[PDB]
Design an enzyme around this catalytic site. Structure first.
Site, PDB file in Angstrom:
ATOM      1  N   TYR A 153       0.816  -1.207   0.000  1.00 44.28           N
ATOM      2  CA  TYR A 153       0.000   0.000   0.000  1.00 44.28           C
ATOM      3  C   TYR A 153       0.855   1.264   0.000  1.00 44.28           C
ATOM      4  O   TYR A 153       2.060   1.229   0.258  1.00 44.28           O
ATOM      5  CB  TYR A 153      -0.942   0.022   1.220  1.00 44.28           C
ATOM      6  CG  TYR A 153      -0.225   0.270   2.530  1.00 44.28           C
ATOM      7  CD1 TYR A 153       0.413  -0.764   3.199  1.00 44.28           C
ATOM      8  CD2 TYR A 153      -0.181   1.539   3.093  1.00 44.28           C
ATOM      9  CE1 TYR A 153       1.076  -0.541   4.384  1.00 44.28           C
ATOM     10  CE2 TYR A 153       0.479   1.769   4.274  1.00 44.28           C
ATOM     11  CZ  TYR A 153       1.104   0.728   4.916  1.00 44.28           C
ATOM     12  OH  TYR A 153       1.759   0.976   6.097  1.00 44.28           O
ATOM     13  N   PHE A 195       2.293   9.962   3.851  1.00 51.31           N
ATOM     14  CA  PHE A 195       2.641   9.699   5.237  1.00 51.31           C
ATOM     15  C   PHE A 195       3.037   8.256   5.502  1.00 51.31           C
ATOM     16  O   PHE A 195       3.617   7.982   6.558  1.00 51.31           O
ATOM     17  CB  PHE A 195       1.479  10.078   6.170  1.00 51.31           C
ATOM     18  CG  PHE A 195       0.278   9.183   6.046  1.00 51.31           C
ATOM     19  CD1 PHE A 195      -0.705   9.449   5.111  1.00 51.31           C
ATOM     20  CD2 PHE A 195       0.127   8.083   6.873  1.00 51.31           C
ATOM     21  CE1 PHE A 195      -1.811   8.634   4.998  1.00 51.31           C
ATOM     22  CE2 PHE A 195      -0.977   7.264   6.763  1.00 51.31           C
ATOM     23  CZ  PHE A 195      -1.946   7.541   5.824  1.00 51.31           C
ATOM     24  N   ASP A 196       2.749   7.331   4.592  1.00 55.49           N
ATOM     25  CA  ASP A 196       3.084   5.930   4.794  1.00 55.49           C
ATOM     26  C   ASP A 196       3.178   5.247   3.440  1.00 55.49           C
ATOM     27  O   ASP A 196       2.438   5.578   2.511  1.00 55.49           O
ATOM     28  CB  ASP A 196       2.048   5.227   5.676  1.00 55.49           C
ATOM     29  CG  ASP A 196       2.585   3.958   6.303  1.00 55.49           C
ATOM     30  OD1 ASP A 196       3.809   3.727   6.224  1.00 55.49           O
ATOM     31  OD2 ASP A 196       1.783   3.192   6.877  1.00 55.49           O
ATOM     32  N   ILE A 252      -6.798  -0.161  10.539  1.00 56.36           N
ATOM     33  CA  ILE A 252      -7.909   0.776  10.683  1.00 56.36           C
ATOM     34  C   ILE A 252      -9.151   0.298   9.933  1.00 56.36           C
ATOM     35  O   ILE A 252      -9.063  -0.534   9.021  1.00 56.36           O
ATOM     36  CB  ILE A 252      -7.499   2.182  10.211  1.00 56.36           C
ATOM     37  CG1 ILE A 252      -6.829   2.095   8.843  1.00 56.36           C
ATOM     38  CG2 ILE A 252      -6.568   2.833  11.214  1.00 56.36           C
ATOM     39  CD1 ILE A 252      -6.503   3.427   8.230  1.00 56.36           C
ATOM     40  N   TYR A 279      -8.667   6.921  12.234  1.00 56.83           N
ATOM     41  CA  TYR A 279      -8.002   7.668  13.299  1.00 56.83           C
ATOM     42  C   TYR A 279      -8.893   8.703  13.975  1.00 56.83           C
ATOM     43  O   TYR A 279      -8.432   9.368  14.910  1.00 56.83           O
ATOM     44  CB  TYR A 279      -6.723   8.356  12.804  1.00 56.83           C
ATOM     45  CG  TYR A 279      -5.592   7.382  12.583  1.00 56.83           C
ATOM     46  CD1 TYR A 279      -5.225   6.488  13.576  1.00 56.83           C
ATOM     47  CD2 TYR A 279      -4.907   7.341  11.378  1.00 56.83           C
ATOM     48  CE1 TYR A 279      -4.201   5.590  13.382  1.00 56.83           C
ATOM     49  CE2 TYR A 279      -3.880   6.444  11.174  1.00 56.83           C
ATOM     50  CZ  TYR A 279      -3.531   5.571  12.180  1.00 56.83           C
ATOM     51  OH  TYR A 279      -2.510   4.673  11.991  1.00 56.83           O
ATOM     52  N   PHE A 308      -5.498   5.819   0.138  1.00 54.51           N
ATOM     53  CA  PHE A 308      -4.574   4.696   0.087  1.00 54.51           C
ATOM     54  C   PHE A 308      -4.504   4.125  -1.321  1.00 54.51           C
ATOM     55  O   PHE A 308      -5.529   3.965  -1.990  1.00 54.51           O
ATOM     56  CB  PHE A 308      -4.994   3.596   1.067  1.00 54.51           C
ATOM     57  CG  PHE A 308      -4.836   3.976   2.508  1.00 54.51           C
ATOM     58  CD1 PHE A 308      -3.589   3.974   3.103  1.00 54.51           C
ATOM     59  CD2 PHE A 308      -5.933   4.337   3.268  1.00 54.51           C
ATOM     60  CE1 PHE A 308      -3.438   4.324   4.425  1.00 54.51           C
ATOM     61  CE2 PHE A 308      -5.788   4.689   4.592  1.00 54.51           C
ATOM     62  CZ  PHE A 308      -4.537   4.682   5.171  1.00 54.51           C
TER      63      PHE A 308
END
Lengths: 355, 780, 107, 142, 378
Positions: free
Chosen positions: C26, C36-37, C56, C82, C99
């Site tokens: 991902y 961020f990821d 999540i 979140y 994502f």
């Protein structure tokens, strides 16, 4: 008593009954003290000779001033560390090791010939010059001044290095030491000397009695030599030998500067401080005799304590003698108006009875 | 980002941003280290690593950020144990030798089989889609094989470039090219990721000629800048530590077989006398001293192989094994044109560097000379490292690893400010050590690791942070004091070592004395446990330590407790709660193993009579009602609720009658325990008689008889049949009368039938008659 | 609370079933487009067992509706990603997460 | 004091306490600790249960657990010792204890000071040269 | 013990008293006395036994005097009379008078020696001997008695030149700053600008001189000279701290921040005052940063006022100086790092948002994280 005798013999198991790892652990700590600690090799004189060698510096195309050799750099670092203002003289591994290395480099130690004795004197002078030509004479003064009257291994090595570079009454080192003090107006040096004298230990009768009871009742002697009575005799002897070396040869300049410091803002009378410590050590020796007066025989623990005290007293008397030998009217009249007589009157009693 | 070579303001701001990134995750902040992975990714922290056109400041910032995020926690954890050697007693350990083969030539430092216990290396995978809370332990993971390969390649390329003295170093200067790259290499070597071939290849870059396993100038001969020289000295010191570790493992490997042979020989020598003592009785007397001597002394006198005094009973064929191993070890340590040895290489490099130029960095000079001292004192490394060596059997390896992990976690919060999140961690660490069986099995290992000193420093920090402004983190002080008390209770040598910190513990002795339920968890309690039932340690007490407790007790008997009067307790002029705790320490100091210490009791009595305020407000003399009238006022205060409580169980409410009773039961307990033993009084020692007379004048006999005559409160049965028993901690207690009997026996004594019968009839028969009636079913 | 653009079609025949480990690769970006990821940054396929409260809410349902071998875009609203507290130091409060998900394998 | 215990036996006291694990405090109550002695074998009286519990809550930590049973298990120590009495010396079988064999006894274990060994005859009462193995160490105390 | 006056309790009324105090006062500036001879010519001559002189307290500018009710009390120069302010040093308590001795013209004969000699202070007119009340740090009251006690011997220790100069600079600065504060208070109370006196050229010159005085040694000096200058700087910082002169600068800053801008200041004040407002604010902040830079005790005594300082960080006229003071405090005092909270950290962060990219804010944030090798996790 009852507990000590019965539990040891039966609960005690021989080494061959212990597990392998426990016996190996005991071996690891025994082997250290027996062999590793007792292995001595002499490298100081070669290390210092190598450190004082200018390595191909004139051959080097520097087009500049003479570079300081590694020994000079080391001494300069140690001197800068002491000259830096701090609340306390911090413990230093490097200084402790190197102040012992350079101290051992200057001594290298039936009736020898005159030629041999002069050989040993010239070698002594050259070895001392190897150090005091690179600023070691002003570094031992700075370290003592930065000590601020606190006893410790940092001072116990500085005082021995000073003795090593002053052995034989080295006039050049004496002149360098006096010139540095007179130029810098260092009151801290004399204040730290007074503090170290006031912190010097004496015979402790209460501690001796406590140790004697502990040994007699069967509790194990924790320390090898029982160095709680007269806690630091070697340090005191070194401190007073340093002062005697400062005045050896009838040095009328140090003999007068240790009493009064003309240029400094305040003056500390090292002459009076020495006799004050002599009075204190006399008062300790007299009490330690009075303890043993009734007893018929002095045991070894008492005999070695008397020896340690008498060595310190002898060193202080030698230092006082060197303070006043030659015509030194100021020192003579300063000791004539002090508690010196109160110490002589007690030493005379001890000498008359103990003898 | 390469455009910042000409934009000097954004360059500086980004350099300081990188410094802030490094600072917010400093000293093991793993939660922030994981968060920083969302801002500086691994591809970013590889591209910035390898890029050659990057500004020097950014290059140095990024090398520092990579290490701090990923490689700073394990490297510090390993450095904190680099000076500690725990070598398991295993078959692979037993195969270690000082030299690789018959040719006694040193192997390459680092390459070999090392079995000493090492901190575990564990990493968490950064992921912001997961919702687990277990990833915030351990540093974020990084590719350590790609990192190794890149570091080796870049170091080789930098060595090749620097030898040509190019005008374009990476980052603009040789300082920006070598210092951070060598720092990364040093961090990797410290963490120990390099193995075998990689270390062999990099040792050739360090020095191609010396490390030539059996023209090209390595880093050591490159005319390096001073910051580069400092890092090279650090690398060389680590290389020397690697040799020390090998030397100290090889000692254990030989020690296994040597100890086995020594034990077998001792058993043989014991049997050969057990079956032959009848030949000569005289010889057995001097032969069984070894078997009756303590195990340490046995091996100490078996290890007299050296010199020629030679009274050890060990035979010659066992002599010549240790004698040869010691010679080989000295050859390894260097104590006897091409250096061919790391020791000679360093000894030459340091002197050559110092004589080429004047070093302007005091730190560089210090690092250069401390390394030269190490090289010239090879026997001085063993004398420092061998005491920190402990051997464990194979079964205890995992448990020792767990204990070492807990200790490393404990050590790691010595560099952080104590807070709520650290309180839990270290309470947990202490609990794990307590529940760890090695902590009890091997107190010598624990003392060598110095956990007592670590807890000492932690509690020192806690007390400093909140001494004057009321105590903060009292649960920390409680746990640390319980741990140190248990440490004393482990072994006698632990108690001796803990005794060395008596001065500070007496300095901070009023930490939690008035806090209820915090008993056994006080620095004063630690000081008491450091001398409890140890005659040698009690006789080692100095007077200056004793006047401190007397001064505190005088202050307590003259001064009120602010915290109690702030909670609302009636404001009397003294501190019964704090005074009892100070009296208890003096009790433990003057009484040992059922006998009074005559050198401490005589000092304590004199101090207490010099400061008469230590006796309480009722034994001052001027206006005091005595002792019987003193503890009859308390037996009414304890029943008056407006004078015994805080005036709006025991953890929240201090009983002001029971506190005064306990103070006046501890003072007389101490004074009765300070009484001289009767063998001295029978012998007629003047000081003993004088002390007994003073103690007897301090307390009248009638004031002691009346207290014994004071009645008790019996539990009662209600209409239900339920047992209505009044609280122990609120009323007059039988344990409060145990001091009166001890004082009356040790100071006054019972010698006449008339007084014996009088004391019986007035105080003992009521107590026995009230106790024999409590032998029912419910009241038992 | 999550819809799905497919970016590259999958088989469309196999979907994650209960108790089966889902291996995804991902890349997660904020609404404004800031990453961020990314598992691709770490070079590591991300594994999680479905229906099991490991990741999540939004990622869970998006991977569930995903097919094997597909590449798809997942948009997670704050209620399923979140919440309003956010992820400290990474995700700001009340942030929509986007994502880029690929389901490499189901195990 | 850990001198009474050994690293050998101290193990079994841990695995017995590890039977209830969960960081020691959990599930270790007065009734729970009454069961760990059952694993060892000794059978304490009911009064012997709470008489020790209150000497140091219900939840008993391992350091408390060790410090408790350390003082009470220094017991039945003469069961092995009785064998040691006849093995140290005098295997001749005549049954006469010689005074010469007693010279191994004085050896000061930390004192290295003499002439108190002579007092050891003096404090030995001549009540009927012959002193029994177990008795020589016994009547002096208690 | 040293004959000194009470510390800075904000009241000269009770600072006008004298007593005996020990401890750290022996190295402070309020225990310093200047001996002034009653002659103009040859006033630097050797002081002899029985020579009349005045005793002046350096940090207050007041003279030791005897009151009508036989009391010791410091009073001003304009009231200090020879009849009230006159003391002599005498070798012993002997009742014999020194008599009339001819006044020498020269250095004279060295009579009283520092430390070694024992002196007894006695009033010239009343003849009373200066002794302690002996009844309740120490606060042993110094009074006047007919014969005193037997332990009434006082020795003399000569203050260093640097110490004396710092002590007098303390007085010269506190007087001017008190005048400035009084003028600003009058302006706030709406006194006419012409009627009220605002020393502002003198304040600017004094603020330049004080920053020059508190100048860290340059890096080109030799090691010994650098360390000596650092020691002198440390002593100056300590002496100014013990006289409450940090709080005086704080008061000046607080009273000058009541005006939003230079125009707002020049509305109430004049414009020769108006164009010298930013400069005075910057000089006060620089002096505050110099009085605490490198002094752990000064930075630790600033923890209580640290909250007040951050409250004005957002102001443009004060941001740089306040940030510099914050950095100096944080880099030195671990105790003041515990005072910083979430609100303070958020204010420092929002300073970046409202002022731009300043690396000095990132430096302060870095200092907030790790201090002296200890990391603050919060």
């Amino acid at each position: 008593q009852r507990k000590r005798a019965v539990v040891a013999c039966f609960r005690m198991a021989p080494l061959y009954n212990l597990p392998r790892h426990r016996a190996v652990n005991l071996f690891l700590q025994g082997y250290e003290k027996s062999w590793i600690e007792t292995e001595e090799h002499y490298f100081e004189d070669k290390l210092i000779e190598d450190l004082a060698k200018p390595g191909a510096e004139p051959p080097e195309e520097d087009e500049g001033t003479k570079r300081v050799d590694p020994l000079h750099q080391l001494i300069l670092l140690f001197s800068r560390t002491a000259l830096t203002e701090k609340c306390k003289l911090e413990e230093d591994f490097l200084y402790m090791a190197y102040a012992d290395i350079m101290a051992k480099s200057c001594h290298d130690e039936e009736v020898k010939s005159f030629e041999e004795k002069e050989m040993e004197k010239q070698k002594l002078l050259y070895q001392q010059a190897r150090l005091h030509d690179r600023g070691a004479a002003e570094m031992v003064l700075q370290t003592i001044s930065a000590s601020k009257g606190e006893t410790g291994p940092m001072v116990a090595a500085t005082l021995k290095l000073g003795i090593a570079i002053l052995n034989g009454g080295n006039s050049t080192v004496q002149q360098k030491m006096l010139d540095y003090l007179k130029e810098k107006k260092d009151v801290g040096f004399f204040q730290s000397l007074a503090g170290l004298m006031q912190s010097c230990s004496v015979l402790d009768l209460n501690a001796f009695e406590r140790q004697n009871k502990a040994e007699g009742l069967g509790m194990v002697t924790e320390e090898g030599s029982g160095e709680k009575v007269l806690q630091d005799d070697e340090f005191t002897c070194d401190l007073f030998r340093f002062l005697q070396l400062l005045c050896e040869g009838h040095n009328s300049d140090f003999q007068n500067y240790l009493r009064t410091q003309t240029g400094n803002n305040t003056t500390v009378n090292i002459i009076i401080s020495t006799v004050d410590y002599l009075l204190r050590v006399q008062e300790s020796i007299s009490d330690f005799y009075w303890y043993y007066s009734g007893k018929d025989v002095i045991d070894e623990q008492g005999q070695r304590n008397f020896s340690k005290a008498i060595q310190v007293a002898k060193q202080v008397f030698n230092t006082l003698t060197e303070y006043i030998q030659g015509p030194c009217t100021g020192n003579q009249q300063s000791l004539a108006h002090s508690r010196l007589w109160d110490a002589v009157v007690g030493f005379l009693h001890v000498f008359a009875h103990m003898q | 980002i390469l455009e910042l070579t000409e934009q000097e303001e954004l360059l500086k701001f980004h350099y300081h941003t990188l410094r802030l990134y490094s600072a917010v995750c400093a000293l093991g902040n793993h939660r922030v280290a994981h968060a920083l992975c969302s801002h500086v990714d691994e591809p970013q922290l590889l591209y910035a690593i390898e890029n050659k056109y990057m500004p020097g400041l950014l290059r140095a910032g990024y090398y520092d950020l990579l290490i701090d995020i990923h490689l700073s926690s394990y490297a510090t954890a390993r450095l904190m144990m680099n000076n500690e050697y725990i070598v398991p007693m295993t078959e692979e350990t037993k195969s270690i030798t000082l030299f690789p083969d018959e040719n006694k030539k040193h192997g390459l430092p680092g390459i070999g089989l090392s079995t000493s216990l090492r901190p575990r290396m564990q990493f968490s995978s950064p992921s912001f889609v997961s919702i687990s809370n277990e990833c915030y332990q351990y540093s974020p993971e990084f590719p350590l094989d790609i990192l190794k390969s890149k570091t080796i390649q870049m170091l080789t390329e930098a060595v090749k470039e620097g030898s040509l003295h190019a005008r374009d170093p990476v980052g603009g200067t040789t300082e920006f090219l070598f210092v951070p790259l060598i720092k990364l290499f040093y961090t990797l070597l410290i963490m120990g990721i390099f193995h075998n071939e990689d270390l062999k290849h990099i040792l050739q870059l360090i020095e191609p000629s010396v490390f030539k396993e059996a023209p090209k100038e390595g880093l050591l001969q490159m005319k390096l800048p001073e910051p580069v020289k400092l890092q090279m000295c650090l690398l060389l010191q680590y290389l020397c530590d690697c040799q020390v570790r090998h030397r100290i493992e090889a000692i254990v490997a030989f020690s296994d077989d040597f100890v086995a042979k020594l034990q077998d020989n001792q058993r043989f020598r014991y049997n050969e006398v057990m079956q032959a003592l009848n030949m000569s009785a005289a010889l057995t007397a001097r032969k069984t001293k070894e078997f009756r001597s303590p195990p340490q002394e046995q091996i100490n006198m078996l290890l007299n192989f050296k010199d020629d005094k030679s009274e050890c009973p060990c035979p010659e064929e066992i002599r010549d094994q240790l004698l040869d191993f010691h010679e080989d070890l000295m050859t390894h340590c260097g104590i006897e044109k091409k250096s061919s040895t790391l020791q000679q290489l360093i000894s030459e490099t340091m002197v050559r560097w110092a004589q080429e130029s004047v070093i302007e960095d005091p730190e560089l000079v210090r690092a250069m000379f401390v390394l030269l001292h190490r090289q010239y004192d090879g026997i001085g490394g063993l004398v420092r490292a061998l005491p920190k060596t402990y051997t464990i059997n194979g079964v205890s390896v995992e448990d020792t690893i767990n204990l070492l992990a807990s200790l490393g976690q404990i050590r790691s919060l010595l560099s952080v400010r104590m807070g709520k999140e650290e309180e839990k961690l270290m309470i947990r660490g202490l609990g794990d050590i307590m529940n760890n069986k090695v902590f009890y099995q091997h107190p010598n290992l624990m003392r060598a690791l110095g956990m007592h000193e670590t807890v000492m420093e932690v509690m020192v920090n806690v007390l400093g942070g909140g001494e004057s402004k009321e105590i903060t983190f009292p649960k920390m002080v409680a746990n640390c004091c319980r741990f140190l008390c248990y440490f004393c209770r482990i072994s006698r040598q632990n108690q001796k070592a803990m005794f060395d910190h008596l001065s500070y513990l007496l300095e901070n002795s009023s930490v939690g004395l008035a806090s209820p339920a915090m008993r056994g968890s006080t620095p004063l309690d630690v000081a008491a446990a450091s001398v409890m039932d140890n005659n040698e340690l009690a006789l080692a007490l100095r007077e200056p330590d004793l006047e401190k407790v007397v001064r505190y007790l005088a202050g307590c008997g003259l001064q009120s407790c602010q915290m109690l009067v702030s909670k609302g307790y009636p404001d009397i002029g003294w501190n019964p709660v704090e005074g009892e705790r100070y009296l208890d320490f003096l009790r433990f100091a003057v009484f040992c193993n059922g006998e009074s210490v005559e050198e401490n009791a005589n000092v304590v009595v004199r101090l207490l009579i010099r400061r008469p305020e230590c006796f309480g407000p009722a034994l001052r003399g001027e206006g005091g009602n005595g002792l019987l009238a003193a503890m009859e006022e308390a037996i009414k205060i304890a029943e008056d609720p407006s004078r015994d409580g805080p005036s709006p169980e025991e953890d929240d409410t201090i009983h002001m009658g029971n506190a005064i009773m306990t103070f006046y039961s501890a003072l007389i307990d101490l004074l009765g325990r300070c009484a001289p033993e009767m063998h001295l009084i029978h012998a007629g020692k003047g000081e003993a008689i004088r002390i007994r007379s003073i103690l007897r004048s301090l307390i009248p006999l009638g004031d002691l008889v009346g207290v014994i005559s004071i009645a008790f409160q019996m539990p009662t049965i209600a209409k239900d049949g339920n047992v209505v028993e009044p609280d122990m901690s609120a009323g007059f207690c039988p344990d409060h009368k145990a001091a009166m009997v001890l004082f009356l026996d040790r100071v006054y004594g019972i010698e006449v039938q008339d007084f014996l019968l009088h004391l019986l009839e007035v105080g003992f028969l009521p107590d026995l008659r009230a106790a024999a009636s409590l032998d029912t079913a419910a009241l038992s | 609370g999550v819809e799905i653009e497919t970016i590259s079609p999958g088989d469309g025949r196999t979907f994650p079933k209960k108790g089966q480990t889902c291996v995804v690769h991902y890349t997660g970006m904020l609404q404004n487009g800031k990453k961020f990821d990314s598992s691709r940054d770490r070079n590591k396929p991300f594994k999680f067992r479905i229906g099991k409260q490991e990741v999540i809410k939004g990622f869970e349902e998006g991977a569930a509706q995903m097919s094997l071998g597909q590449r798809a875009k997942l948009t997670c609203t704050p209620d399923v990603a979140y919440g309003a507290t956010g992820h400290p130091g990474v995700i700001p409060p009340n942030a929509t997460l986007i994502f880029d998900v690929e389901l490499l394998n189901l195990e | 004091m850990a001198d009474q215990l050994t690293e050998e036996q101290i193990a079994e006291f841990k695995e017995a306490f590890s039977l209830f694990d969960k960081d020691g405090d959990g599930t270790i109550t007065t009734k729970e600790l009454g069961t760990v002695m059952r694993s060892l074998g000794q059978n304490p009286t009911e009064a012997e249960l709470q008489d020790m519990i209150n000497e140091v809550n219900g939840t008993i930590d391992f350091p408390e657990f060790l410090t408790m049973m350390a003082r009470k298990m220094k017991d039945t120590d003469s069961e092995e010792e009785i064998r040691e009495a006849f093995r140290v010396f005098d295997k001749d079988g005549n049954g006469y204890i010689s005074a010469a064999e007693l010279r191994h006894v004085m050896t000061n274990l930390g004192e290295k000071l003499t002439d108190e060994e002579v007092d050891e005859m003096i404090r030995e009462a001549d009540i009927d040269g012959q002193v029994n193995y177990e008795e020589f160490v016994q009547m002096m105390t208690a | 013990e040293c004959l000194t006056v009470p510390s800075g309790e904000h009241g000269e009324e009770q600072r006008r008293t004298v007593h005996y105090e020990g401890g750290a006062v022996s190295v402070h500036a309020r225990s310093l006395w200047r001996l002034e001879t009653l002659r103009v010519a040859w006033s630097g001559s050797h002081i002899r036994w029985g020579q009349p002189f005045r005793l002046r307290h350096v940090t207050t500018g007041k003279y030791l005097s005897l009151m009508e009710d036989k009391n010791l009390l410091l009073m001003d120069k304009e009231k200090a009379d020879v009849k009230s302010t006159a003391f002599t040093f005498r070798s012993s308590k002997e009742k014999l008078d020194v008599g009339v001795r001819k006044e020498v013209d020269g250095m004279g004969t060295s009579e009283i020696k520092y430390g070694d000699s024992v002196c007894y202070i006695q009033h010239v007119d009343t003849g009373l001997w200066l002794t302690y009340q002996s009844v309740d740090s120490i606060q042993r009251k110094a009074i006047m008695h007919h014969e005193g006690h037997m332990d009434d011997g006082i020795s003399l220790s000569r203050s260093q030149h640097e110490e004396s100069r710092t002590a007098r600079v303390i007085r010269s600065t506190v007087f001017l700053f008190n005048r400035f504060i009084r003028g600003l208070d009058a302006l706030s109370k709406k006194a006419k600008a012409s009627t009220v006196d605002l020393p502002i050229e003198s304040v600017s010159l004094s603020l330049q001189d004080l920053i020059g005085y508190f100048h860290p040694p340059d890096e080109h000096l030799e090691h010994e000279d650098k360390q000596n200058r650092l020691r002198a700087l440390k002593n100056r910082q300590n002496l100014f701290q013990e006289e409450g002169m940090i709080n005086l600068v704080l008061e000046c800053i607080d009273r000058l921040h009541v005006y939003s801008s230079a125009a707002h200041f020049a509305d109430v004040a004049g414009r020769e005052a108006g164009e010298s407002w930013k400069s005075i604010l910057n000089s006060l902040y620089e002096l505050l940063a110099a009085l605490i830079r490198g002094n752990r005790k000064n930075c630790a005594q600033f923890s209580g006022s640290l909250d007040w300082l951050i409250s004005r960080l957002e102001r443009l006229e004060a941001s740089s100086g306040i940030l510099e003071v914050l950095h100096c405090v944080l880099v030195e005092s671990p105790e003041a790092l515990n005072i910083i909270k979430e609100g303070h950290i958020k204010s420092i962060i929002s300073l970046l948002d409202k002022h731009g990219r300043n690396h000095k804010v990132l430096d302060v944030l870095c200092s907030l994280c790790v201090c002296h090798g200890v990391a603050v996790r919060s």
